[PDB]
Scaffold this active site. Structure first.
Site, mmCIF file in Angstrom:
data_model
loop_
_atom_site.group_PDB
_atom_site.id
_atom_site.type_symbol
_atom_site.label_atom_id
_atom_site.label_comp_id
_atom_site.label_asym_id
_atom_site.label_seq_id
_atom_site.Cartn_x
_atom_site.Cartn_y
_atom_site.Cartn_z
ATOM 1 N N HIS A 161 0.799 -1.219 0.000
ATOM 2 C CA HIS A 161 0.000 0.000 0.000
ATOM 3 C C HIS A 161 0.830 1.267 0.000
ATOM 4 O O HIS A 161 0.259 2.351 -0.158
ATOM 5 C CB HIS A 161 -0.934 0.052 1.209
ATOM 6 C CG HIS A 161 -1.988 -1.000 1.182
ATOM 7 N ND1 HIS A 161 -2.866 -1.141 0.126
ATOM 8 C CD2 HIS A 161 -2.284 -1.987 2.060
ATOM 9 C CE1 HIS A 161 -3.674 -2.158 0.368
ATOM 10 N NE2 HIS A 161 -3.349 -2.679 1.539
ATOM 11 N N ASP A 197 -2.495 -10.556 -2.861
ATOM 12 C CA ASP A 197 -3.122 -10.142 -1.608
ATOM 13 C C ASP A 197 -4.565 -9.704 -1.870
ATOM 14 O O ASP A 197 -4.894 -9.220 -2.952
ATOM 15 C CB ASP A 197 -2.293 -8.993 -0.990
ATOM 16 C CG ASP A 197 -2.844 -8.465 0.347
ATOM 17 O OD1 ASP A 197 -3.894 -7.787 0.338
ATOM 18 O OD2 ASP A 197 -2.168 -8.646 1.399
ATOM 19 N N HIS A 199 -6.224 -7.209 -0.904
ATOM 20 C CA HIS A 199 -6.384 -5.781 -1.128
ATOM 21 C C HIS A 199 -5.601 -5.335 -2.360
ATOM 22 O O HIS A 199 -4.611 -5.955 -2.756
ATOM 23 C CB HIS A 199 -5.912 -4.993 0.092
ATOM 24 C CG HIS A 199 -6.590 -5.388 1.363
ATOM 25 N ND1 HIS A 199 -6.082 -6.353 2.205
ATOM 26 C CD2 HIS A 199 -7.737 -4.949 1.934
ATOM 27 C CE1 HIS A 199 -6.888 -6.491 3.245
ATOM 28 N NE2 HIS A 199 -7.890 -5.638 3.114
ATOM 29 N N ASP A 286 -4.669 -13.051 2.966
ATOM 30 C CA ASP A 286 -5.960 -12.580 3.450
ATOM 31 C C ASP A 286 -7.092 -12.863 2.469
ATOM 32 O O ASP A 286 -8.235 -12.481 2.729
ATOM 33 C CB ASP A 286 -5.904 -11.087 3.803
ATOM 34 C CG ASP A 286 -5.111 -10.240 2.809
ATOM 35 O OD1 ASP A 286 -4.701 -10.726 1.731
ATOM 36 O OD2 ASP A 286 -4.901 -9.051 3.134
HETATM 37 N N1 LIG Z 1 -8.809 -0.862 11.529
HETATM 38 C C1 LIG Z 1 -9.248 -0.645 10.151
HETATM 39 C C2 LIG Z 1 -9.864 -1.914 9.498
HETATM 40 C C3 LIG Z 1 -8.846 -2.877 8.849
HETATM 41 N N2 LIG Z 1 -7.809 -2.145 8.013
HETATM 42 C C4 LIG Z 1 -8.231 -1.941 6.579
HETATM 43 C C5 LIG Z 1 -7.221 -2.501 5.530
HETATM 44 C C6 LIG Z 1 -5.724 -2.351 5.877
HETATM 45 C C7 LIG Z 1 -4.787 -3.084 4.904
HETATM 46 C C8 LIG Z 1 -4.500 -4.555 5.223
HETATM 47 C C9 LIG Z 1 -3.871 -5.445 4.160
HETATM 48 O O1 LIG Z 1 -3.731 -6.680 4.422
HETATM 49 N N3 LIG Z 1 -3.457 -4.972 2.966
HETATM 50 O O2 LIG Z 1 -2.927 -5.870 2.146
HETATM 51 K K LIG Z 2 -4.076 -7.617 -4.575
HETATM 52 ZN ZN LIG Z 3 -4.251 -7.398 2.306
#
Ligand SMILES: NCCCNCCCCCC(=O)NO
Ligand SMILES: [K+]
Ligand SMILES: [Zn+2]
Ligand SMILES: NCCCNCCCCCC(=O)NO
Ligand SMILES: [K+]
Ligand SMILES: [K+]
Ligand SMILES: [K+]
Ligand SMILES: [Mg+2]
Ligand SMILES: [Mg+2]
Ligand SMILES: [Mg+2]
Ligand SMILES: [Zn+2]
Lengths: 345, 345
Positions: A161, A197, A199, A286
């Site tokens: 990210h 992933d 996301h 995930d």
């Molecule tokens: N407390 C906020 C809720 C969970 N957070 C949102 C997504 C964060 C990114 C995680 C990920 O695994 N990105 O690949």
């Molecule tokens: K992805």
């Molecule tokens: Zn993720």
């Protein structure tokens, strides 16, 4: 098997106590037991040699990230404490729509300028763990460059990210992008980064968005519904030289492997026609049917199938660890990808 | 002299319990006792008649704020609760630099799209309190339009940080901008909005930024150092037809009235040449020497001088209440402005 894993014990220097979630401060999802559980499975399965990372310094980091951002991440915690805040470092304000993208002097302003969300607290040791995680990815890239077919960069914190100068989604340095750019700087003409992933890899997309030498592809849950919300849509194909060198493949809630793997096949065909000289896989588990913050339905067995399909691309392959938050299965899931790559069914 | 005050007992419908501050969730600064203490001082000083607002509906609000944003504020709490979140409604993610200003479907995405900060929790009653506060400002504008020289809109929540479709800084509807646009809609050719709150009125600036019929001026602490951080700099003079019709005057920490009044004189000079038909004063007393979140050094007596200097502009004047967070003095400070306006030294 014999796939080597790079792991740094310095990851545990990042051990924050709070994460903003649904209006409350909760125990963070991105917790050190994630990396320790994967590592234990790597050992239990005798996947291959495990090594600690070499120190590559900030040079290879600053091929992707801006010097101002790198400096900010080193001093953020000290400045936060100096300004008298009592919690962990969390942004409270940001460049809202209609405001100026102008770097201010105050630490709160800088925190907001460099962030895309408030679930990613910073505290002591975050800088050190982020530095170590980038070196984990660069050590894996070196192993592959020097002859390994593939290597597993057991990165924590994750990276996909992070933009050139934006942190968030639990990420600070974009390990996958850093590894891809290392390939390029070492004379690999074309690199593909494939993001499996759950996301969207918005940081990776942004970093190479105007470039055709690095092809970026991400499969992910629909950003209309989940983080990162404001990038990842299928109409984002790149800009300038990079138009047609970014590909987003979006899926809705409850998507199983029978459907997700159809997108995987489209991504694989895109890589095949691009014909890269190296492949970086930003691997999050995930996508798992039990993941607490995601909505796909992959089984543990599906990760063997994923790893097998990735090996069939026939490319020098660096895996960087991203997300995955069911800690009971995270090690079985991540190592299954590596074992399926190496031949296990 | 006497001045009428418009006060809505509906301000207490906004009664949140959490504010993100320095990485912690603390008791909010913008608390109901603010409005109750000012009202008690208005009574005890016998400033003038106190009345409740008339209900004007959303028509006049929508002359300033977008239909989508007004709809979002009405439904936000209900959608947040229906999505299963357990805290008050606080943004976690937003449009970071390099991301798309694109409205998503999920309530977390909507929250971030419509905000500039995370310190402004939304809960049950916020919608109703915001509506009432806008009506308070519109009632004061009506009182002036019908013959009063001036009227005190005892607004809570405050308004001056709210853009046409962005909330934050404890603000939801830009009461000052709504009153200014009401003057214009009722045939006042030119209106000036003078922001003496400690913080930049970025919302009011943004709303009228390309317009020459509404002059916006703000005195505030340097945004390099304090909220709102990303607007308020002295080079923001307007755009298009609006160029030279916005004026920001910035001061550093510890600035006393003897210096601040020099900027006030510069603003009054700019008002005089503009020669408006009505004046809206966005009044915060967070310029006070004991304000807990601000760094100016005005004394309670300085507010009498402020009120007197504003009367000397000779304009029909609406005061909308903005910030000020030392509850011990908030009543004396704000009513001092009204009393100085009516000739008290
Ligand atoms: N407390 C906020 C809720 C969970 N957070 C949102 C997504 C964060 C990114 C995680 C990920 O695994 N990105 O690949
Ligand atoms: K992805
Ligand atoms: Zn993720
Ligand atoms: N927990 C956040 C720290 C203090 N809050 C930031 C400034 C909000 C603006 C208030 C105001 O009075 N604007 O005029
Ligand atoms: K690209
Ligand atoms: K101001
Ligand atoms: K203007
Ligand atoms: Mg600050
Ligand atoms: Mg959500
Ligand atoms: Mg005191
Ligand atoms: Zn203020």
């Amino acid at each position: 098997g014999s796939m080597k894993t790079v792991f740094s014990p310095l990851h545990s220097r990042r051990h924050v106590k709070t994460e903003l979630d649904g209006g409350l401060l909760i125990e963070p999802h991105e917790k050190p037991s994630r990396a320790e559980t994967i590592l234990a499975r790597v050992k239990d399965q005798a996947l291959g040699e495990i090594l600690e990372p070499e120190e590559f310094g900030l040079g290879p980091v600053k091929r992707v990230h801006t010097a101002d951002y790198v400096s900010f991440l080193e001093t953020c915690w000290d400045e936060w404490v100096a300004a008298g805040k009592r919690g962990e470092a969390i942004p409270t304000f940001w460049v809202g729509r209609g405001m100026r993208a102008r770097l201010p002097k105050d630490i709160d302003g800088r925190l907001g300028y460099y962030s895309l969300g408030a679930d990613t607290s910073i505290s002591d040791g975050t800088w050190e763990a982020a530095r170590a995680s980038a070196n984990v990815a660069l050590t894996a890239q070196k192993l592959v460059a020097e002859g390994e077919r593939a290597a597993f960069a057991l990165c924590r914190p994750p990276g996909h990210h992070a933009h050139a100068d934006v942190f968030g989604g639990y990420c600070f340095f974009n390990n996958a992008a850093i590894a891809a750019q290392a390939f390029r700087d070492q004379g690999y003409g074309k690199v593909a980064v494939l993001d499996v992933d759950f996301h969207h890899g918005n940081g990776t997309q942004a970093i190479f968005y105007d470039r055709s030498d690095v092809l970026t592809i991400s499969l992910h849950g629909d950003p209309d519904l989940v983080f990162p919300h404001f990038l990842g849509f299928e109409d984002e194909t790149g800009e300038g030289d990079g138009e047609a060198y970014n590909l987003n493949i979006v899926f809705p809630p409850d998507t199983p492997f029978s459907i997700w793997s159809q997108g995987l096949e489209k991504a694989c065909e895109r890589i095949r026609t691009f014909a890269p000289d190296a492949l970086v896989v930003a691997l999050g588990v995930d996508t798992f049917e039990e993941d607490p913050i995601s909505f796909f339905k992959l089984t543990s067995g599906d990760y063997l199938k994923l790893g097998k399909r990735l090996e069939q691309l026939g490319l020098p392959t660096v895996f960087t660890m991203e997300g995955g938050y069911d800690v009971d299965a995270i090690g079985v899931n991540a190592v299954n990808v590596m074992q399926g790559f190496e031949g296990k069914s």
